[PDB]
Amino acid sequence: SGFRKMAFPSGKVEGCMVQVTCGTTTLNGLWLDDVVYCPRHVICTSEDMLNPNYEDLLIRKSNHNFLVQAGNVQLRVIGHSMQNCVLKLKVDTANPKTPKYKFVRIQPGQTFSVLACYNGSPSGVYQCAMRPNFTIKGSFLNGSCGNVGFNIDYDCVSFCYMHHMELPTGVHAGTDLEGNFYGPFVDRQTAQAAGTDTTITVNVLAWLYAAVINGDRWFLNRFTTTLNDFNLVAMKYNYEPLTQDHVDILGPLSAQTGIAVLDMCASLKELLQNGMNGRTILGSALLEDEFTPFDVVRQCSGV
Amino acid sequence: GFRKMAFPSGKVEGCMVQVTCGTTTLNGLWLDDVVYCPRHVICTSEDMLNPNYEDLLIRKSNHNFLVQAGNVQLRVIGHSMQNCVLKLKVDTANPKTPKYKFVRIQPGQTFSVLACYNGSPSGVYQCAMRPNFTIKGSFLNGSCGNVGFNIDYDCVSFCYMHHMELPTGVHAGTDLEGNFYGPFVDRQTAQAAGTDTTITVNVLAWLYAAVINGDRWFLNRFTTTLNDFNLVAMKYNYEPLTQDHVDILGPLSAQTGIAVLDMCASLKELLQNGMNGRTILGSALLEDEFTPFDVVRQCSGVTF
Ligand SMILES: *[C@@](O)(CO)[C@H](C[C@@H]1CCNC1=O)NC(=O)[C@H](CC(C)C)NC(=O)c1cc2c(OC)cccc2[nH]1
Ligand SMILES: *[C@@](O)(CO)[C@H](C[C@@H]1CCNC1=O)NC(=O)[C@H](CC(C)C)NC(=O)c1cc2c(OC)cccc2[nH]1
């Protein structure tokens, strides 16, 4: 028993982190087989970054313009291309530690692990969720561009995030490994706002189930609600609507606890309307929405 | 961004193995040519109720122990018991052994746990050792022998190996020399921990982290002595500070220019008067599982 924000083990990704430098600009890259993936703004000077014409800047670069270091070894760049906001550097050497991998595009509300890494050296690992407004609430500092987010299924690493930006509000933005931003953001040195965020309702409900599984029931009540009537109140509070698919994904948690989903929904509605008084749930004073149903089932199955 | 962060787990993943005796299986830690694991692996379920470990071990030979890295067996060639830990000498030195140390941590100290089932790592998360010598972890059946660690430079400091889940759902275990943290024993019995307290040095670290981020409404105009602060803190079920606690706050004190005892006086007012409906770092709750090193780490990007 117990419930904790948990990341996937990071070793398979650690073996792929390298450092990429062009001019006086340095960030992290991801070394898979004989290709190194990194944010394309590594080719910019401070002056270029305000309004970079990336295709124009890239064609003026030569392979020798790129310094790639994998620990204490320099990797020789023998080719370069760019796919949207991701620069791809061909090197003459295959990474022997390349895991089985895929590139995927994650959906809002799904979680992933981030390997924090600076100058190509891994520093920490933590779990994030893709927000409905396509931002991430992460812990990226200077030099964190090129950090990647991932999930691991069996032995396959599914890369879903590359880090590019910190917004003025302190949340973060980035791309998939195809170089497409999540959300309406652009890799230029400007202050950018996100759309209004919303709360990931299916994840709050999963987390309430985890709290019940771990002996926390104070927020339950004897009431039920219809799905529509729940969604009416949820939307009033800037919660995402709960779909029937979401209801279905929560089935196993409902079965384990014997609490119907719409019964939990009635609990959540009362919590939104009354607050938590001074009380906590799983040690939190706020309703947590960055655990998916799968995240909860993985830590609570059997308990 | 300020959030809980585990260390990268790869150096430890390469050291996880499975240890089985009969049908009893758990996890072990493979460093050089020795595997470390909880000694109750030698017990049947019924043996675990009231074990005499010295007697149970005399009956065991090297050939009764199955150690597997993945599906690959590592032949056991020696065995000995050290407190609550079994040490199995194996015929292969782990080529992935990192630079490592065995350390015994203080309450309040944090560490990463590599969750691991059947010798296969499944996740990593950050834990704090509570003042009552429990940890609020996430441990299912088959998690015994999971380890807790910190990584400084390229050296892994192992501090915890998992044994037990208490009735209340918190967790208990040993250091890597087999000595339990707290007054627990490795027997199949319901055991209770002392009443827990709040980790004062970590609350202070978090207040420094708030100040570093420009959130400083709670800075008051008073100071205090260490002794007067400790006596008042205990009335709020906060841990007394030690001299080591004062010392490890030093860098955060210097970074902000706020003397440690002035921060103590500020915390004391927060305890006596509450938050008055205000938050710190976006929380009405005073957080106590970030150490001074965690705050310096996750504000400066220390890598390993
Ligand atoms: C990368 O490490 C740079 O290579 C860096 C990551 C952030 C720095 C601090 N925390 C981070 O997550 N990213 C940037 O510096 C990006 C670079 C762009 C994509 C070329 N820019 C920003 O993060 C950025 C610029 C501005 C800004 O300007 C003007 C105004 C306000 C916010 C802001 N963020
Ligand atoms: C190990 O995996 C066993 O090798 C296991 C880990 C726990 C099971 C579920 N979550 C865990 O953290 N540990 C145990 O089963 C230990 C075995 C001892 C050390 C021999 N025992 C307990 O965790 C334990 C026993 C009892 C108990 O008895 C009766 C009554 C109440 C609680 C309790 N916990």
User: Across the interface, do A138 and B13 touch by the CB < 8 Å criterion?
Assistant: no
Q: How many CB atoms lie within 10 A of CB A267?
A: 20
Residue whose CA is at the smallest distance from ligand 2 atom 1: B144
Instruction: Give the span between the Cα atoms of A47 and B303, in whole angstroms.
Output: 29
Return the structure tokens found at A237: 């509070």
Map A150-175 to HEC letters: EEEECCEEEEEEEEEEECCCCCEEEE
- Asked whether the beta carbons of B191 and B184 are under 8 A apart, the reply is yes
Residue (of B197, B291, B268) closest to B238 by Cα position: B197
Query: Residue B68 pairs with which residues in a beta bridge?
Result: B18, B73
Residue (of A206, A302, A215, A216) closest to A261 by Cα position: A206
CB-CB neighbors (< 8 A) of B165 in chain A:
1
CA distances A111 to A105, A128, A138, B26, B66, Å, are 12, 6, 12, 29, 37
Return the structure tokens found at B294: 């965690």
Lining ligand 2 with CB less than 6 A are: B 26, 40, 48, 139-144, 163-165, 167, 171, 186-190
Element of type H or E holding A245:
helix A244-249
User: Across the interface, do B9 and A12 touch by the CB < 8 Å criterion?
Assistant: no
Of B13, B285, B304, the CB nearest to A11: B13
Phi, psi of A3 (to 5 degrees): -145, 125
CB-CB neighbors (< 8 A) of A10 in chain B:
8-10, 124
Nearest atom of ligand 2 to the alpha carbon of B24: 4
B301: amino acid identity, one letter? G
Instruction: Give the span between the Cα atoms of B96 and A43, in whole angstroms.
Output: 36
Strand residues in chain A grouped as ranges (E): 17-22, 25-32, 35-39, 66-70, 73-75, 77-83, 86-91, 101-103, 111-118, 121-129, 148-153, 156-166, 172-175
Note the maximum CA span of chain B: 69
CA distances A302 to A5, A107, A194, Å, are 18, 28, 40
Documented resolution in Å:
1.8
- Asked whether the beta carbons of B219 and B258 are under 8 A apart, the reply is yes
Residue whose CA is at the smallest distance from ligand 1 atom 15: A165
DSSP character string of A41-78: GGG--TTGGGS--HHHHHHT--GGGEEEEETTEEEPEE
Of A7, A283, A286, the CB nearest to B125: A7
Residue whose CA is at the smallest distance from ligand 1 atom 3: A145
- Asked whether the beta carbons of B239 and B291 are under 8 A apart, the reply is no
Q: Residues A27-41, buried b or exposed e (16+ Cβ, 10 A)?
A: bbbbbbebbbbbbbb
DSSP character string of chain B: -----BPP-HHHHTTEEEEEETTEEEEEEEETTEEEEEGGGG--TGGGGS--HHHHHHT--GGG-EEEETTEEE-EEEEEEETTEEEEEESS--TTPPEEEE--PPTT-EEEEEEEETTEEEEEEEEEB-TTS-B-----TT-TT-EEEEEETTEEEEEEEEEEE-TTS-EEEE-TTSPBSSS--SSSS---PPPP-B-HHHHHHHHHHHHHTT--TT--S----HHHHHHHHHHTTBPPPPHHHHHHTHHHHHHHT--HHHHHHHHHHHHHH--TT--BTTBSSPP-S--HHHHHHHHHT---
Length of chain A as a residue count: 303
Q: Residues B225-238, buried b or exposed e (16+ Cβ, 10 A)?
A: ebeebbebbeeeeb
- What residue of B is the nearest CA neighbor of A4? B138
Instruction: Name the H helices within A67-200.
Output: none
Phi, psi of A98 (to 5 degrees): -50, 115
Instruction: Give the span between the Cα atoms of A19 and B154, in whole angstroms.
Output: 18
Residue (of B196, B122, B124) closest to B166 by Cα position: B196
Residue (of B217, B241, B227, B234) closest to B271 by Cα position: B234
Residues of B with a known catalytic role: 40, 144
Percent helix, strand, coil in chain A, to 5, is 25, 30, 45
Spell out the domains of chain A, with CATH numbers in brackets: 15-91 (2.40.10.10), 99-175 (2.40.10.10), 201-298 (1.10.1840.10)
User: Across the interface, do B124 and A6 touch by the CB < 8 Å criterion?
Assistant: yes
Return the structure tokens found at B16: 């996880």
Instruction: Give the span between the Cα atoms of A287 and A276, in whole angstroms.
Output: 9
CB-CB neighbors (< 8 A) of B139 in chain A:
1-2
Ligand nearest to the CA of B146: 2
| DSSP state at residue A281 | B
